[PDB]
Amino acid sequence: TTVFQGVAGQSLQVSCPYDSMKHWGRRKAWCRQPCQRVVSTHNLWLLSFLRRWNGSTAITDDTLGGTLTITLRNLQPHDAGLYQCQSLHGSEADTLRKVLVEVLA
Amino acid sequence: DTTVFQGVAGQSLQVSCPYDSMKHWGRRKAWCRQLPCQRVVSTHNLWLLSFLRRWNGSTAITDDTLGGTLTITLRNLQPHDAGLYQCQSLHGSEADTLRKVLVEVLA
Amino acid sequence: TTVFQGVAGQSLQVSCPYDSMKHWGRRKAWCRQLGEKGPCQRVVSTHNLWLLSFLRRWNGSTAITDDTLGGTLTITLRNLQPHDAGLYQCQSLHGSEADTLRKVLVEVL
Amino acid sequence: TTVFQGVAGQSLQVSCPYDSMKHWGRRKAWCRQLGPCQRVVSTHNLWLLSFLRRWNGSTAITDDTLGGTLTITLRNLQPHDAGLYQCQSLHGSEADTLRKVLVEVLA
Amino acid sequence: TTVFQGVAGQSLQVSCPYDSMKHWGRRKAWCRQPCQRVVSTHNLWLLSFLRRWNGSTAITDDTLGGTLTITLRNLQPHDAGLYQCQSLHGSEADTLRKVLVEVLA
Amino acid sequence: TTVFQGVAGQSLQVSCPYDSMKHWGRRKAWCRQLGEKGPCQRVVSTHNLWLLSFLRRWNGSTAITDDTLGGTLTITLRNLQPHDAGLYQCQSLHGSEADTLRKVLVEVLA
Ligand SMILES: *[C@@H]1O[C@H](CO)[C@@H](O)[C@H](O)[C@H]1NC(C)=O
Ligand SMILES: *[C@@H]1O[C@H](CO)[C@@H](O)[C@H](O)[C@H]1NC(C)=O
Ligand SMILES: *[C@@H]1O[C@H](CO)[C@@H](O)[C@H](O)[C@H]1NC(C)=O
Numbered sequence: 001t002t003v004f005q006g007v008a009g010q011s012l013q014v015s016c017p018y019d020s021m022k023h024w025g026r027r028k029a030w031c032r033q034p035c036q037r038v039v040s041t042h043n044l045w046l047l048s049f050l051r052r053w054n055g056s057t058a059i060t061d062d063t064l065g066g067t068l069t070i071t072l073r074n075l076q077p078h079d080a081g082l083y084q085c086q087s088l089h090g091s092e093a094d095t096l097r098k099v100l101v102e103v104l105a
Numbered sequence: 106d107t108t109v110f111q112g113v114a115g116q117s118l119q120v121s122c123p124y125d126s127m128k129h130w131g132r133r134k135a136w137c138r139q140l141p142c143q144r145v146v147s148t149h150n151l152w153l154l155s156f157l158r159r160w161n162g163s164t165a166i167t168d169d170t171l172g173g174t175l176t177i178t179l180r181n182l183q184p185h186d187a188g189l190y191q192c193q194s195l196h197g198s199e200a201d202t203l204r205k206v207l208v209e210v211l212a
Numbered sequence: 213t214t215v216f217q218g219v220a221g222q223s224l225q226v227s228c229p230y231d232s233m234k235h236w237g238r239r240k241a242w243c244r245q246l247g248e249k250g251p252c253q254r255v256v257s258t259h260n261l262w263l264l265s266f267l268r269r270w271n272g273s274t275a276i277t278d279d280t281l282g283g284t285l286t287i288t289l290r291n292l293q294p295h296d297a298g299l300y301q302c303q304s305l306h307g308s309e310a311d312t313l314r315k316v317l318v319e320v321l
Numbered sequence: 322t323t324v325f326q327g328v329a330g331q332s333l334q335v336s337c338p339y340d341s342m343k344h345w346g347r348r349k350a351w352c353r354q355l356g357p358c359q360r361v362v363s364t365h366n367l368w369l370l371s372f373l374r375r376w377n378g379s380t381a382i383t384d385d386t387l388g389g390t391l392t393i394t395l396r397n398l399q400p401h402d403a404g405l406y407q408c409q410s411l412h413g414s415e416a417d418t419l420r421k422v423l424v425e426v427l428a
Numbered sequence: 429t430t431v432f433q434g435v436a437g438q439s440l441q442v443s444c445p446y447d448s449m450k451h452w453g454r455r456k457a458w459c460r461q462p463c464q465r466v467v468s469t470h471n472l473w474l475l476s477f478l479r480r481w482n483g484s485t486a487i488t489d490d491t492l493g494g495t496l497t498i499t500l501r502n503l504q505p506h507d508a509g510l511y512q513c514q515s516l517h518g519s520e521a522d523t524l525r526k527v528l529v530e531v532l533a
Numbered sequence: 534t535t536v537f538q539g540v541a542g543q544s545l546q547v548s549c550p551y552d553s554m555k556h557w558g559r560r561k562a563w564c565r566q567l568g569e570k571g572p573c574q575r576v577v578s579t580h581n582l583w584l585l586s587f588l589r590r591w592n593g594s595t596a597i598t599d600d601t602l603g604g605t606l607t608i609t610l611r612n613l614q615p616h617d618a619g620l621y622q623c624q625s626l627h628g629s630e631a632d633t634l635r636k637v638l639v640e641v642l643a
């Protein structure tokens with residue numbers, strides 16, 4: 001597990017490394033813990049660089065470097081908890097990283 | 106603060122400007138001189154080709170939007186090129202400053 | 213050891229030459245070494261496909277490109293800060309071993 | 322005749338500006354004074370691919386023909402690399418000196 | 429109306445900037461003041477970088493950076509006058525810039 | 534003819550520059566010359582697919598690779614031994630023929 005803390009009201013940047021060759025062709029998803037799915041990368045894998053949003057949560061993927069980037073805009077106290085980066089393939093979903101987010105003031 | 110770059114006259118000077126790639130996602134960049142900030146060069150009008158080097162006179166510019174770095178080349182640097190400049194990020198008709206740069210020329 | 217020094221807040225370019233024939237076909241890595249035979253932690257490596265070594269790979273604020281014809285490995289430390297100073301290794305990968313191409317001290321002015 | 326100073330064991334970049342319209346369509350070369358100037362590297366035989374890096378030994382050359390900048394890279398600079406060199410613009414069978422360069426190796 | 433001044437018997441380089449995306453696909457012309465056409469860029473717009481000559485006048489176009497370059501080789505007093513850079517579209521021609529060429533001994 | 538000397542037991546690198554435009558599309562070969570314009574015993578040649586000329590090709594402890602853009606052929610003699618010494622040709626191949634790019638004397642030192 002990894003912990004990311006950010007000041008309230010600002011953007012928090014969560015980085016998620018993976019093996020770019022192992023997960024080649026797979027979309028990624030950001031979910032919160034069951035595991036409520038928040039956002040996934042674009043349906044067209046060659047457009048994984050595209051920033052996609054759910055509310056004030058953005059996801060973007062560098063598939064050459066193997067870096068998945070989740071952005072949390074306007075970090076509120078409610079946004080603390082436990083989340084997962086996952087790699088989707090068919091119906092299954094391997095966890096890439098489990099992430100705990102903290103807020104400060 | 107304002108970064109200082111030093112180059113020898115008659116040689117090429119590479120000025121770099123880091124920025125946050127998420128904050129400025131999708132935004133073109135520009136390079137201008139202070140006299141007001143007079144525009145010198147901007148990156149490609151199509152953001153997905155920001156890596157393509159654009160020239161204006163002896164100044165070139167390229168953008169690496171994934172790494173979050175803007176690179177400006179001052180070709181054949183001359184003492185009259187010394188002065189104050191700005192890396193900017195454009196959206197709508199506003200120009201957010203990313204870095205103030207001071208260019209010094211030597212012997 | 214070779215010393216590279218740069219101004220803080222500006223990009224620093226580090227180049228490691230190597231024998232292109234001895235390390236033909238090998239991927240490269242840049243790593244940070246904290247002990248004479250210390251952990252030596254991976255920072256960034258070249259493309260998983262060796263014929264695409266020339267493509268810039270980013271990890272964080274570090275970029276790597278390899279010129280396998282000239283035998284020159286180029287590392288870019290973007291926005292150099294004091295915490296970047298220290299000892300690093302250019303390494304050539306084969307199997308699960310890494311051979312040292314060059315030891316590099318990064319100093320920050 | 323400009324002086325380019327480089328640290329030994331590191332790659333030294335020599336940059337060489339030229340009038341891009343007066344040398345249009347022309348190949349460029351790097352040579353070392355010995356005395357006659359002996360040819361080291363030249364740019365791509367096809368002028369429209371001059372941007373493509375060409376190596377001879379520990380010397381590389383690339384040409385940006387739009388901006389009018391020629392770049393030479395001395396790889397792994399050694400003490401025996403110091404000396405006088407020349408950027409040349411080729412046309413027919415004559416070579417015009419674009420820039421005389423003194424290379425200085427430090428330590 | 430910008431002024432360009434060049435010593436007689438030597439090359440004068442006249443540069444006209446323009447908006448590259450606005451003029452995408454359009455060829456350019458150099459005209460002398462009606463407006464008598466002197467030289468225009470290549471018929472194949474993807475070869476606009478090609479230097480075209482009319483006598484001692486040459487024209488070349490950088491469609492990526494949006495810079496048109498006119499060269500008056502071996503400038504002579506009878507080349508002084510008022511000129512125009514133009515963008516050709518369909519059958520019309522829009523003035524990019526008006527250029528005053530001046531010569532010195 | 535130029536001499537390339539190496540110490541016995543270590544890799545020796547031979548270089549053959551050539552006019553990359555003149556020899557565009559031609560494979561290259563390293564062969565041992567045993568007579569006055571006579572037998573050229575072929576040792577190793579670059580890849581049969583010319584766009585793959587960068588590929589390292591082996592015969593025993595001898596390797597060849599070709600930089601067709603810069604115009605440089607590289608022969609590697611790994612673990613140089615006395616039986617490697619001799620007169621060699623760098624060749625440019627076309628049809629059934631061969632143009633001599635360079636003549637090389639390989640010498641071994643203990
Ligand atoms: C956005 O996140 C909420 C939070 O659970 C979820 O209910 C909703 O379905 C998401 N939107 C989309 C389009 O998936
Ligand atoms: C180049 O500079 C001129 C004036 O300095 C300006 O009119 C032109 O639009 C510029 N071009 C670019 C691509 O910035
Ligand atoms: C980037 O760094 C992280 C740890 O900081 C590591 O997990 C990942 O493998 C690295 N990426 C590459 C391509 O080396």
Ligand SMILES: *[C@@H]1O[C@H](CO)[C@@H](O)[C@H](O)[C@H]1NC(C)=O
Pocket residue numbers: 359360361362377378550551603604605
């Ligand atoms: C490289 O330079 C050397 C002189 O230092 C020369 O003999 C050789 O021919 C050059 N290479 C090419 C491909 O011309």
Ligand SMILES: *[C@@H]1O[C@H](CO)[C@@H](O)[C@H](O)[C@H]1NC(C)=O
Pocket residue numbers: 465466467482483484485
């Ligand atoms: C340019 O060419 C046109 C016809 O293409 C001709 O009428 C004109 O005289 C020429 N101008 C010069 C300066 O040669």
Ligand SMILES: *[C@@H]1O[C@H](CO)[C@@H](O)[C@H](O)[C@H]1NC(C)=O
Pocket residue numbers: 574575576577591592593
């Ligand atoms: C290796 O070279 C010898 C001559 O030295 C030759 O007879 C043999 O056929 C070569 N083998 C291959 C696989 O090319």
